[PDB]
Structure formats: structure tokens, C-alpha cells
């Protein structure tokens, strides 16, 4: 199947309580593999998947230096952004950055991305061509001018198209057991009366990987999207995911309702029925 490597960085200011909180995590697909936490004792980039543990001391030293450099940049950013938006110190603010690369089933580069947000909203992002920027407001235009004058996109492009893809392939190979697996969902539906005249029908998918999945309800073949409660896909904690969708239906009409499950691990999409 297709694959991705992504790094996620969050910095949060806490004025009058010292330095900002900085957390970095890295993922291959839906499997986390590294972390750094600025408040933690180690001050090291740390392994969070078995297959990254074999990387040598140069790797861990080098990744620790990178993540500390990102932390210092974001620390400065929190100050700069307060100035750009004429904000006070009375409150906490959040910078987020995420970047990485996608590859197809043949492990060739599909696309790259490098995005930044301030207080939960898009701030600036590299466009699809990896040569130009989308700035979301006027403050982010200032950053665009500075990043264009400094040729930031060219350095990012070299990473996203090259280095990023090379390390993703390395990780896919070393962690093949975990990363190149598909676990198809184990599916069922549950039925519970909510009164003498209505029932909740809940369609379940369990123990699947990767996390991408579609669960839908139909009534006589007609999608019931406005009437469906669909929960966020959630981790089981063992490396697999769970999700459910529910509808509340008049008792006696169960046989009109079907749940439909799509996942890359299934040989064909499943239709679950009450008959």
C-alpha cells in the first residue's frame, strides 16, 4: 500500500512560568516512532517503536540536535508572532509545524508538505510544487517575504523529495513486520432497544491497521449520512485501531439497514446485514 513519514511539532508559551513547552513526534503511517519532550529529564530524542531502536548513537545524537534546533526556532517564533499580531503576555499561544512525504505503493515520491499554524489556524504552508508559499493572512505574508528572500523552499524541497523519501524507505524495510502489514477489521453490528419503538444499530470495526477506514449505513441502499453518528477512529493501544457508526431506527425496520465497511485489508468491501 501507500506510505507516509510525518513529523509533528507543538510549542506552547506559558508566560511567567518559564520557557515554552515543546513536543516533537514522528510517524511512519499510523505508527509513532520517536518523541522529544522539552520538559522531560533526558533532553534526548527517544525511540517509541521497536524497529527504530537499532539506530546507532550517531542517529540519536543527530536527531536530538535537530529537535533542539527546532525547539529554539519555535521559541523565537512565539515572540515574533506576538509582535506580528500585537498580542500581549497575558495569554498562552500555540505554534504547530508538520512536515513530511508521501509515497505510493511502489515507494516512489508522490508529494511533500510543510505546514505551519498559529493558535490552531493555518499560518503558512509550502504549495504542492514545493517552490512557493501559501500565506493565510497578512502577518504570514511577512514570513513569506522573509522565507522567499532566504530561499527556504529550496532547502525544504531537497529534504521532502530526497532525504525524507530515503529515510521512509529505510524505516519501511527495518520495521517491515509492523509497517508493511495490513490488519483487516473484525466487523460486527450490535442491536439495543432504546425504547419499545426504537433501537440503536451500531456497526463496529476492530483490530485494524492502517487507520484509514470507511464505515457507512444505508437504508434500502440509500446513504444515511445525516442520521449516522460516526466516532473518531481510535487506537486500541496495541498498534491497531477501532471505529464505530450508529443509527437509531424504528424497531421492526432493522432489515432495511445495512452497514458497509471499506478497508485496504479487506479483499472486498463488506456489507453487514440484519437478515
Amino acid at each position: 500500500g501507500s506510505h507516509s513519514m510525518r513529523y509533528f511539532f507543538t510549542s506552547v508559551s506559558r508566560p511567567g512560568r518559564g520557557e515554552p513547552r515543546f513536543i516533537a513526534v514522528g510517524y511512519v503511517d499510523d505508527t509513532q516512532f520517536v518523541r522529544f519532550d522539552s520538559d522531560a529529564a533526558s533532553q534526548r530524542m527517544e525511540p517509541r517503536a521497536p524497529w527504530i531502536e537499532q539506530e546507532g548513537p550517531e542517529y540519536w545524537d543527530g536527531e536530538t540536535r535537530k529537535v533542539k534546533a527546532h525547539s529554539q526556532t519555535h521559541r523565537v517564533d512565539l515572540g515574533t508572532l506576538r509582535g506580528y499580531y500585537n498580542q500581549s503576555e497575558a495569554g498562552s499561544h500555540t505554534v504547530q509545524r508538520m512536515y513530511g512525504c508521501d509515497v505510493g505503493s511502489d515507494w516512489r515520491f508522490l508529494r511533500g508538505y510543510h505546514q505551519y499554524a498559529y493558535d490552531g489556524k493555518d499560518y503558512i504552508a509550502l504549495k504542492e510544487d514545493l517552490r512557493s508559499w501559501t500565506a493565510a493572512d497578512m502577518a504570514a505574508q511577512t514570513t513569506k517575504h522573509k522565507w522567499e528572500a532566504a530561499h527556504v523552499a529550496e532547502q525544504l524541497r531537497a529534504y521532502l523529495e530526497g532525504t525524507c523519501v530515503e529515510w521512509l524507505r529505510r524505516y519501511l524495510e527495518n520495521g517491515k513486520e509492523t509497517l508493511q502489514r495490513t490488519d483487516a477489521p473484525k466487523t460486527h453490528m450490535t442491536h439495543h432497544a432504546v425504547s419499545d419503538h426504537e433501537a440503536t444499530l451500531r456497526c463496529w470495526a476492530l483490530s485494524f491497521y492502517p487507520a484509514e477506514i470507511t464505515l457507512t449505513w444505508q437504508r434500502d441502499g440509500e446513504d444515511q449520512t445525516q442520521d449516522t453518528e460516526l466516532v473518531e477512529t481510535r487506537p486500541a493501544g496495541d498498534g491497531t485501531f477501532q471505529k464505530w457508526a450508529a443509527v437509531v431506527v424504528p424497531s421492526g425496520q432493522e432489515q432495511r439497514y445495512t452497514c458497509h465497511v471499506q478497508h485496504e485489508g479487506l479483499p472486498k468491501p463488506l456489507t453487514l446485514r440484519w437478515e
Binding site: 507543538t10 513526534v25 510517524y27 509513532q32 504547530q96 490552531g120 473518531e232 481510535r234 493501544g237 464505530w244
Partner: protein, 100 residues
């Protein structure tokens, strides 16, 4: 400033069977800003041995965290997750319902 409410789910790793060790999860997703208080409760009391995942976020910038502890379900013991966040005017308790 943007604020987004956590979506809270409380559930077991494996289908629950009384007397069989398992994991109790409280997954909170979709929230902003990141500051959040999450506790697992057993019979209304805070469980002390609770781990959590490293802070990460989704494509829309909202945060997610998994809180978890090993547990062995029984008939009588009631489990829940208590969450506070700037979007909630009081802490919110979601009860574990094993018959969903």
C-alpha cells in the same frame, strides 16, 4: 482565539470479560488548545497508574491523546474518564459502557 472541544471516548482494548486482564483507554481528540486534564476513574476515584501517549495532532491541527491503564474488569466496578478543558464549563465525565 480558536477553541475546539475534546471528543472523549472510553473503551477497552479487547472485548471485556470479567476477571480477564485488559486495558482501559480514554481517547480525547479534536481539541484546541492543547492544555487538557484527563483522569481515569474507578468507582468515582482517580486511578493513579495512568500512562498517556505523546501529544500529536491531526490534519486540521486539532490535538489528540490516549490515556490508558491495565485493568481487570469485574461485574461491580464502574469505570469512567473525567476531562477538563477550556471549552468545558465544568469537568465532563464519560462512563465506560461495555455493551455498546
Amino acid at each position: 482565539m480558536i477553541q475546539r472541544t475534546p471528543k472523549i471516548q472510553v473503551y477497552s482494548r479487547h472485548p471485556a470479560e470479567n476477571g480477564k486482564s485488559n486495558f482501559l483507554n480514554c481517547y480525547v481528540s479534536g481539541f484546541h488548545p492543547s492544555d487538557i486534564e484527563v483522569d481515569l476513574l474507578k468507582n468515582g476515584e482517580r486511578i493513579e497508574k495512568v500512562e498517556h501517549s505523546d501529544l500529536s495532532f491531526s490534519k486540521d491541527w486539532s490535538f489528540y491523546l490516549l490515556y490508558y491503564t491495565e485493568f481487570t474488569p469485574t461485574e461491580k466496578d464502574e469505570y469512567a474518564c473525567r476531562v477538563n478543558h477550556v471549552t468545558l464549563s465544568q469537568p465532563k465525565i464519560v462512563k465506560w459502557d461495555r455493551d455498546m
